Subunit: 353 residues, 4 copies
């Protein structure tokens, strides 16, 4: 009862990274990360397991750039296994590949009667990682599913989430998860925080969960709330090993969403998997759209470029240095307004702003 | 003189609930609450004693859903007794009923020369609870009226308010109140905070008053400031036993307000009982309108659904667990902006957002 | 060097007054205040010494209501003496009058070669109080003028300002001031804070200066930043004995400003005495207008009504109880947004909001 | 890992300067500053080394007013040497001049293969100061260039930057810099903070770097984020010896930018040297424009006037008193809203607001 209000949470717009001594240019920093010893990325960027972000074209484009795509689960078992199989069979100097030289891929599952059959067919399609993808990962049903998957497939890479506390992170890892996916409500189209009243500001969520994961030698995926390339530097410096992106990739050519025309501008639909449209209720997502942006490679190049620039300012030669050594400073809303362009009429913006 | 500035107050938008381990699904949590041992709700939701929110149709619809309606006092004694009598005589598996199987109902009274005659006629109409409904419950006139009612009717359920401090809560309970109604200025159409300069941010008000009420074994109604279903989770986790709603129910079919057409959209009027229109001055309310929303059952279903979702995230199997165990985290305005949808063009919203 | 950033300042919108036990109704509270033993108000409200707020009509209307008008100094010595003489000769149960039954009045002077001649003619016109009215009261020139006036006129009431610190308050009182006028930059049309970079948030300014003034048995006028009736409750609870108003009275019939028509609405001009227009530079005011509001009595009645309501909520039977006993609570921007009307379409406002 | 979030940063809009006892009128304060013993300004204002702010006309106008212009480096070595030579040969009672009675001037260089040849030609053109002008001054490449310049030219004035920490300030001074230029991301058209995630709110940056520079007997230039004359008082009171301005001077006659017409108003272009347009990428600037403002002397006169007014309020007889003695108070967003004009319709603004 007395402790009810002591905790304080920060998100991306509350903080800046403090520059430090640099000896490594942005172009020479190392962006590789091992989520597990058999799940290695050359850039710390994952496309979300959402029906408006990732099917095989997005998963192929992401692995060719050294990242990872998660095939969404809003499709039949047989359809999802075929999508994984198309990525595995695809035929890019930064490409992330398995021991057989095939592009890496992941696939989402839920906690339903079907889960173990879905996992079996995805493993037979040589998926590199399963994502146990739920609204509330800190739940007995989720812990039971992690355990049953880990028992059936002792070497299978498992990402489980979503969570936002040290205690939940601990519980998923004790059940057998390799990677904990962090974020409760920060998503661009998510309304969890408003309709349920629940969540943790994302920089605090990442930091608290990464602090726990490090005790177990496991890794974090920072899922949600990222709006700019600098938010990637921030998410990783807070402890994340890799980021997961939805809205920043939903407008790209390889995303599966419907196109919409409005005021002569092309958009693609972007919607929550908690929206009335995706689950088909008391919804925890809404439906929106984001401008058409062209090939995902051009968006990734700008996002990775901002990350490399941030690492050069922090003097981080690699992502371990960024996670372990980078320092934040807290800012007010006046700090935030100074950090964006201000007091000038803007005519032309940039790919990255 | 020195203590003048130390206290700090929080409201709904300052805080989020921290998720915890869940073993009970949203659909299986228990939403029942005893405001007194003879005043039991199956959902913790009360319609306000306002002439734009509650007469008998609203009171009937609320009790059929397991909640409670307070008949407003802007009508004759004989009119208010007839309204109570229509609810009692009304003829819904979650319905909240008295020992004779009749829907529960409440009725508001003020502190005037008439009060004891109004109370007598409402008791003869078998009202389940009286609400002593005043702007400043921490006043000698209010304490004297609580005492005279409690002396005349030793078993009558009494709600008294409004207050926002432990000391006021203590005083109303010492006079004989069963339930303390909390809120000074958070109402959608209230201007108390601006025209008088007075109030307490509502989450702090609820917490401080619930901390005192628990010492006396009494209950709190969180009255005002609720805009979304998640604010209900927050109000109850702060210590409230039940919420009281005005603006969220004023647009519903069963509300008594006038309809208004504007830009081809139907609204209903919503006004303070401190507005120049309702009292008929130096007013402490203004007049407004809110969109027509259809049957109150559909609004209650979405509000209760968000509460159940929040309880599943908090791992609360019932409202006692939510009040006693749920933890908050404080957020900045940047936290709040992350918690709402952001950085996407919204086309379609949801019943609950 | 190390102390440069420790101090924190609050203004009106940072705080609310905490309700307390009331035994005295708003209508029965006492609003009288002695600024000095020979300068007594029946309501704690002073019209500003500005060429868009106070000449004799405003000074007469204010004293008839129990307040005070300060005749501005943007006119000849002989003109200002005649204005004082018209108020003194004017011929209202709350009227504030001198020992000869004549309405009280004040008049502004600056620190120039002319000051002592201006003061002589105002005293010969039986002015009740001189206001030494400067941008920076904590200046050697101002202290020398206070001393020369106090030496020449041992019984003359002297208001001196403006200041915002305990040290400045101490210095003006040591020179011979009876009343210290507090406010550096909070004025509606003031730009001191932006063009000079200087100021103190007004609730902190009032509190710090009142804390010092009490040590000397002297009084404070809270000058500037008041937008609503509740800000008057706040200013006095922070330590002010009386408030000084500019923009809230500039639209009233008795103000001297020019009228302007815009979008079929009548306005009156309101401008700083630090604006290029009033001084005739590097200006510290701009020029604006405020809607025509009718007779000053109707505005004062609403402002005083909000003050009385706040005092009833605080349980303050008189202004000494409000200054000495009332407690504040700090709120965020979310607190402020809850305190105003919110989440309803407003059709009709009130005289006081 | 544990220290990641403790630091807090402030910028201009977070703070106000506390008025103090004044004996020196604004018109009589001393505005001179020695950046080095051979680099003396009569006003503490420097025009930025940007291709939309400073070539020879701006450098001449700034030195005639007692300030300094930095010739930008987006031009050939031979072009930049000619610009310096035009200022040196130019033929104003506050003019800042070298020992030979010639207007002072500076010139920017980068860290490239060409740098030492550029510096040689600028020194042969009798430049008064070199600015080693980089995005991240806390970098080995920058430290090596400072050392090579200082070794080749033992008496040459060197400004080096940009930085935002004590450690970076220390490193540049140990390499041989005389003056450290402070600012990482506060620029009107800068996007460093958003695309890289990095920076320090500018008042904190100035204070931390000035605290270190004082230990070495060196000076700070506060570069970026200044929007109003009062922000100059603030920057210098935080520890800066002089300010550097870009957007506030880009609209003036002497700036080199292109003119643009929009809605019958004349503008000049203002763009980052990190924008795609200026470097010719992953850009850290965007492109904008600012209204045409007339001769730079009229803008400087208003900026210097606001500084003098702030110094009179602080009781600072000279800039050393302002840097060493002036105190700040922290304000909320409500403080900031009170500090600007508010609650009045503005018709006419002022040159300085």
């Amino acid at each position: 009862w007395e402790s009810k209000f002591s905790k304080e949470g920060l998100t991306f717009d509350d903080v800046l990274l403090v520059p430090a001594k640099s000896e490594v240019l942005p172009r020479d920093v190392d962006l590789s990360v091992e989520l597990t010893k058999t799940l290695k990325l050359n850039i710390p960027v994952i496309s979300a397991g959402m029906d408006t972000v990732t099917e095989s074209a997005m998963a192929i484009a992401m692995a060719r750039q050294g990242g990872l795509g998660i095939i969404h689960k809003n499709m039949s078992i047989e359809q999802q296994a075929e999508q994984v199989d198309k990525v595995k069979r695809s035929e890019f100097p930064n490409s992330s590949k398995d021991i057989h030289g095939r592009l890496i891929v992941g696939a989402a599952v839920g906690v339903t009667g079907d889960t173990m059959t879905r996992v079996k067919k995805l493993v037979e399609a040589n998926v590199d990682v399963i994502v146990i993808d739920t609204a509330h990962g800190h739940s007995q049903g989720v812990l039971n599913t992690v355990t049953k998957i880990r028992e059936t497939y002792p070497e299978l890479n498992i990402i489980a989430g979503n969570v936002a506390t040290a205690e939940a992170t601990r519980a998923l890892i004790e059940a057998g998860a390799d990677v904990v996916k962090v974020g409760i409500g920060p998503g661009s189209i998510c309304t969890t925080r408003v309709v349920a009243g629940v969540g943790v500001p994302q920089i605090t969520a990442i930091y608290d969960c990464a602090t726990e994961a490090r005790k177990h030698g496991k890794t974090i995926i920072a899922d949600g709330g990222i709006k700019f390339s600098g938010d990637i530097t921030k998410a990783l410096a807070a402890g994340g090993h890799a980021v997961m992106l939805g809205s920043l990739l939903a407008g790209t050519s390889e995303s599966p969403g419907e196109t919409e025309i409005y005021q002569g501008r092309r958009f693609k639909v972007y919607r929550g998997m908690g929206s009335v449209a995706a689950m088909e209720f008391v919804p925890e997502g809404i439906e929106g759209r984001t401008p058409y942006k062209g090939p995902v490679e051009e968006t990734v190049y700008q996002l990775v470029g901002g990350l490399r620039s941030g690492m050069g300012y922090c003097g981080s030669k690699d992502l371990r240095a960024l996670r372990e050594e980078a320092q934040f400073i807290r800012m007010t809303g006046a700090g935030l307004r100074e950090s964006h362009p201000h007091d000038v009429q803007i005519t032309k913006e940039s790919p990255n702003y």
